[PDB]
């Protein structure tokens, strides 16, 4: 008959933004899982080995632009 | 077989502290590294075991 | 030693005055002058051995007076049979006093003793006041020996001048003194070989 040379696929990795704008986060809380820097680390946000953006401090998450880059900041809580 | 697992032991307290991989063809001889020896409690020269 | 070269002195006085008078530059620092001299040689038959590169290094070192930059192959090519990173050419950049005295030596001594020398074409400018030409043979530089050269090699000589336009570059290099300006012979062979190869059909 016939057969397919396809049928392989990788497991779902579950990327994407995990905390949206204004959401209160704790220090170290993961903000976005991603491959490559679609979002760059902004103020109060660190970037991990697999390009995960996480919170360096408590506060509220905001998405903005720092110079020419899309960045994610954590504004310290009032 | 071409990139075997080599074990680095400290040349002071002969303790197999670390394990890593070399190329055997790109690095035929035993490798020398300065790693942290927990027993010697400092950075000591580490050599691949024979 | 400390002495401003003959060619540099001639350039400054005579050539700067002549250019200021017969181009009418409205600013004093617009008179063109030699910026640098580049001595290249592609020794591409070095993909099979290293002795040819050593000989080329010795020859260019003796000719110029400084160690050459040896360029490694940017990309490998099978039909030229060169791998990646092999040394296939060497070049020297001369500026200032070394530039001036090498140019003086070359013009006064070397190309005069080219076999059946007929001068240099005036139509070998890049189009921006810089003039590059080629020597097919090397030992004609009498600053080197004669009976120990490994093999005959050639080279490319490039004069880069701060000249905006081709006509003023030609004027500068004439005033410095270069065999050329004749007529056909130069431009003649030029047009010829030009048209000839200039076609292309890699497809």
């Amino acid at each position: 008959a016939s057969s397919s040379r396809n049928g392989r696929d990788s497991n779902a990795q579950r990327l994407g933004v995990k905390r949206f704008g204004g959401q209160l986060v704790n220090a170290g809380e993961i903000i976005v899982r991603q491959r490559g820097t679609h979002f760059h680390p902004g103020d109060g946000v660190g970037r991990g080995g697999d390009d995960t953006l996480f919170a360096l401090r408590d506060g509220n998450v905001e998405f903005g632009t720092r110079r020419g880059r899309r960045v994610v900041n954590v504004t310290p809580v009032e | 077989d071409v990139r075997p697992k080599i074990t680095l032991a400290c040349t002071e307290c002969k303790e197999r502290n670390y394990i890593t991989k070399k190329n055997r063809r790109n690095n035929p001889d035993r490798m020398e590294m300065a790693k942290f020896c927990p027993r010697c409690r400092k950075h000591t020269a580490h050599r691949e075991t024979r | 030693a400390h002495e401003m070269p003959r060619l540099k002195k001639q350039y400054r006085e005579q050539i700067r005055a002549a250019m200021q008078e017969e181009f009418g530059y409205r600013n004093p620092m617009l008179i063109p002058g030699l910026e640098k001299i580049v001595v290249n040689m592609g020794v591409g038959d070095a993909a099979h051995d290293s002795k040819v590169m050593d000989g080329a290094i010795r020859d260019i070192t003796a000719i110029t007076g400084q160690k050459p930059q040896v360029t490694k192959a940017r990309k490998s090519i099978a039909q030229f049979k060169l791998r990646e990173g092999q040394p296939i050419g060497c070049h020297v950049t001369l500026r200032g006093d070394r530039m001036w005295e090498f140019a003086d030596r070359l013009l006064t001594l070397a190309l005069p003793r080219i076999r059946d020398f007929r001068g240099l074409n005036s139509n070998q400018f890049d189009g921006k006041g810089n003039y590059t030409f080629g020597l097919s043979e090397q030992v004609m530089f009498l600053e080197i020996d004669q009976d120990k050269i490994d093999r005959i090699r050639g080279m490319d000589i490039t004069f880069v001048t701060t000249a905006q336009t081709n006509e003023e570059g030609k004027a500068l290099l004439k005033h410095l003194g270069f065999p050329f300006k004749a007529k056909d012979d130069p431009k003649k062979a030029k047009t010829k070989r030009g048209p000839a190869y200039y076609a292309k059909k890699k497809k």
């Binding site: - | - | 005295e101 006064t108 001594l109 005069p112 003793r113």
Partner: protein, 66 residues
Amino acid sequence: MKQGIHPDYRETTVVCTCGNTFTTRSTSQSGTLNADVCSKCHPFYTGKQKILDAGGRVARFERRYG
């Protein structure tokens, strides 16, 4: 310049065996060089030549017959 990588490039006069002598700090370890011919002593532009050609095909005819 970097020390120890460049050749000897001391002074060097030049006798062109033709009434022309200059001084350039070339690489001639010995010193002055000896020119078989200068540029001002050479037949190229000092005008000492003028070959052009010999295109008188008819001129040959009356040379050997006229």
